[PDB]
Design a protein around this ligand. Structure first.
Ligand SMILES: Nc1ncnc2c1ncn2[C@@H]1O[C@H](COP(=O)(O)OP(=O)(O)OP(=O)(O)O)[C@@H](O)[C@H]1O
Ligand SMILES: Nc1ncnc2c1ncn2[C@@H]1O[C@H](COP(=O)(O)OP(=O)(O)OP(=O)(O)O)[C@@H](O)[C@H]1O
Ligand SMILES: [Mg+2]
Ligand SMILES: [Mg+2]
Lengths: 337, 190, 340, 192
């Protein structure tokens, strides 16, 4: 049978911490995707159209990680495209049909399976015309790609080179767009918060609360053409990771950062052990970098730099303990021989 | 006084009062005269045209002034489509308190240590000449006195008899007393 | 024979809800074109210009539906082109002659039928003129496509590959062109032409009402948008689509064969759960979708985010038979009433 | 007086009068008597600076012999309302409402220069007391309420009892920067 959305999320909880709304949206979309695939196509039955998703989240929130984790239990072809490599039809670069080309190459060019696949288009915010209005000049990397995707996101017939062009119907192909709309928080704040000067006016961020109230009007003001937003009905938002989520990210996931470094020290014969206050200090310091969970690596690498430098030289070392003072102060971790 | 110049990023150089007018802030500072009231009217008319829907913020720090001058502001506030929010800074006395209470109901504010004073009008003009002229000016002053008390009673949701008692002599009120009276709706702190 | 405008619109109502003025305009123009071709006594001095159609309107207003319904009814060589794929002849992409090639393929390459067919071109607002380029070697995707398209819209002869792998000469004097697109800058162009306003007591002072703005479009406004004037002069008929109101959105939500309500009821029919919407729920869904400014496309987003907390649980909830979506589920953060 | 013009280097040049240039650095001056017009300029500058940056401190330089209580209260309530801390500094003198606004600065950020003079006292006439005895009674009661309000707010600023401020503001109480720091009017004395 089909895996329920709860099971799909249970597969995502192993790699992604938090972001329950985005995981629930992705699970429901994949479940409805399967149901469309097995629904009868002809007869008195209504034809089910797809509901695409737009992943909006800050840097290091888990968009690409959500897609990679979802791709492990799909049972249908899947690719991760890059919008920064896309271009208009008449200019150099990859055309939007290369997305179908990659999805087709994943399945041995079996069109019947490629037409039932899922596509994740990363960096969808990097093709946004910053103008909010018609671009004064050809935006070959931006607005033009948005226009070329309208037929691709919706149902059309893609003509791609062979493995003699191949016709691929993109009507049942689910598209999951994602990107870190950096300047979107200012647009949402200007629309909702009555900012200004004087008493009775708002003075200024809370990117989580702002993204939780995002509307197509803000995405239009950011630089997405309304025709593309209308084809991305589901808008799943990812929250900025708090001090309590950044602690669980360090230890809980399958490929957690602490586990990665315990394995690096496992290539030697030395055990690496962290303390609770150490993990909390690492999370609170990474919070200040405004880089998401990517900042935890900058702290664990800075504090373990000298230790990893001396690790292959120290003989008889059996265990390294990283305390709270090692993070907040430039101390050396306790070496156990 | 030297009015400071500030730079708006968009660069445009404003004096600080024109910069605040860009934010829909109109100041009534000092006595209410024909000239100071007409500037308020000019700003209220201008702001309605810029945006008939957005609130206008009318900051009042005034000991009073001419009744006719204050009435030009008052009728302009009620006429124009956008709500005129009023805020008492320092003091709103006499016609200043009248214009403060004249703000949109629910949007009349005062700062915590502001002083609000209401009273019957004084001379709207001298009463010289013959007894027939003095009778005329006395009758006109009484009509103004009744008109002010009636409009004040409407602003405050009180009876006309209450305003007639309370405006007999200078009635000084804290921001809390003016809120309880009905002159203002809220007291701002932060 | 020739389906009359009353018949044309009576069958456009089966697929397009609302936009009555546009359906009348398209039906009258198509009937006049086909009758004009059948009675070429207009060879007299009267130069009845080819009544091409420009179909402007917001996104999700039903441009691409009017084209398809007009196509499948008229029983005539009809092609749906996308200006996003069009390019200048000397560069990669589809030159404007591929449209005539598709028109021939739609009629078994019998040129006599293709020369009297219809050509629909979507997203024609995407090939507008722009300043000299960032992305500068040649503005290939822009004005060049407009000129190559103008050379077809006016009476010319195209050379296209044969029926098999000897080119065919196709005269497009009698081919009707119906161009459409969501001109996103047109409301600002019009609002600069008008919206003078005023100041003072005795002057009228005053979201853009793009409905009445689109209803007062002038050829010069489209020229400012970036379209060449010689192309607009060849597009005399301008059909405008209004923003779908609450009632039209409700009808779209329930009436069509593939309505959202029926789509989700069948989506729950893969399980054994009945889905039922209240009249107030449909009203609030239509209102919230109209507030998103995406047309009928903003309807699916609302119905999807209101049922998200339910589709996540349907396979886990056993014994469930019916789910009722009320006005509270749409307007408030409520859960639909589960009937076990 | 001729206010000098200075040039600010930027990404180009912008010519300021020297006071607008210092306002760009979040420095607001209260110089001379506190009037409706001079107080409203301070309020306008405080409101403007909050919008430019709600988090950065505002530096309120005070060289004032006093002035109107209502005018000073417009500054006082604006200082307490706006989000950014208003640091106060006494240059030359802070007397009467000038000393009140000096003590009104953010606790820990109230400064004075080493030879500045700070004077606190009960208010004088907030307005004439003419007319009938009923009018004089009303104005006397209002002045007493202002006197109590000022002493109460001063006692709060200085972390002292209301009874202490009532004694010390009875007549003109002149204080050096050190005495004002010990009293609780200022927090620090600047030297370099
Ligand atoms: N919610 C999360 N749970 C677990 N790990 C996370 C999470 N968010 C980020 N990470 C860590 O950050 C790394 C990269 O994060 P990811 O690429 O998903 O961020 P992103 O949203 O794609 O950022 P950007 O928007 O800049 O592309 C991963 O290797 C992962 O270990
Ligand atoms: N007038 C209408 N009547 C019925 N359904 C409509 C109407 N307008 C939009 N829809 C619904 O919206 C969906 C797509 O609309 P359509 O593609 O016609 O919009 P469009 O004008 O092509 O938008 P765009 O200009 O962005 O391409 C259809 O599946 C249809 O169900
Ligand atoms: Mg990524
Ligand atoms: Mg379309």
């Amino acid at each position: 049978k089909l895996p329920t959305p709860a099971e799909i999320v249970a597969n995502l909880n192993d790699h992604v911490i938090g972001q329950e709304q985005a995981k629930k949206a992705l699970a429901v979309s994949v479940y409805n995707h399967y149901k469309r695939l097995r629904h009868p196509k002809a007869g008195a039955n209504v034809e089910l159209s797809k509901s695409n998703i737009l992943l909006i989240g800050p840097t290091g929130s888990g968009k690409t990680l959500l897609a990679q984790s979802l791709a492990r239990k799909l049972d249908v072809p899947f690719v991760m495209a890059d919008a920064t490599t896309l271009t208009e039809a008449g200019y150099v670069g990859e055309d939007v049909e290369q997305i179908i080309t990659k999805l087709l190459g994943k399945c041995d060019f079996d069109v019947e399976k490629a037409q039932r696949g899922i596509v994740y288009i990363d960096q969808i915010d990097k093709i946004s015309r910053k103008s909010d209005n018609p671009s004064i000049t050809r935006d070959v990397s931006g607005e033009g790609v948005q226009q070329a995707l309208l037929k691709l996101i919706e149902g059309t017939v893609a003509s791609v080179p062979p493995q003699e062009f191949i016709n691929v119907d993109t009507t049942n192909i689910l598209f999951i767009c994602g990107g870190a709309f950096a300047g979107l928080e200012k647009v949402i704040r200007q629309r909702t918060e009555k900012g200004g000067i004087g008493f009775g006016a708002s003075v200024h961020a809370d990117i989580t609360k702002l993204f939780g109230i995002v509307e197509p009007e803000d995405l239009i003001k950011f630089g997405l053409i309304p025709e593309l937003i209308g084809r991305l009905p589901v808008i799943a938002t990812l929250e900025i990771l708090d001090e309590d989520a950044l602690i669980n990210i360090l230890t809980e996931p399958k490929n957690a950062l602490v586990k990665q470094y315990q394995a690096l020290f496992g290539m030697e014969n030395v055990e690496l052990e962290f303390e609770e206050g150490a993990l909390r200090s690492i999370a609170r310091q990474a919070m200040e970098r405004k880089t998401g969970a990517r900042g935890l690596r900058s702290i664990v690498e800075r504090c373990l730099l000298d230790t990893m430098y001396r690790l292959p030289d120290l003989k008889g070392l059996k265990k390294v303990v990283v305390g709270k003072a090692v993070i907040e102060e430039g101390r050396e971790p306790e070496l156990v021989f | 006084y030297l009015v400071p110049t500030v730079i708006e990023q968009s660069e445009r150089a404003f004096d600080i009062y024109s910069r605040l007018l860009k934010e829909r802030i109109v100041f009534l500072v000092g006595p209410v005269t024909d000239e100071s009231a007409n500037l308020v009217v000019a700003q209220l008319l201008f702001l309605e045209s810029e945006n008939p829907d957005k609130d206008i913020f009318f900051y009042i720090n005034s000991p009073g002034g001419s009744v006719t001058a204050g009435m030009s502001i008052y009728d302009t506030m009620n006429f124009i489509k956008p709500d005129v929010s009023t805020l008492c800074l320092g003091q709103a006395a006499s016609m200043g308190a009248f214009l403060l209470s004249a703000g949109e109901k629910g949007k009349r504010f005062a700062l915590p240590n502001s002083r609000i004073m209401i009273h019957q009008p004084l001379i709207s003009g001298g009463l010289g000449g013959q007894a027939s002229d003095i009778e005329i000016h006395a009758r006109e002053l009484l009509k103004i006195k009744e008109k002010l008390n009636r409009l004040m009673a409407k602003h405050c949701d009180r009876d006309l008899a209450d305003l007639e008692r309370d405006t007999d002599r200078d009635n000084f009120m804290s921001a809390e007393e003016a809120k309880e009276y009905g002159l203002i709706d809220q007291i701002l702190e932060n």
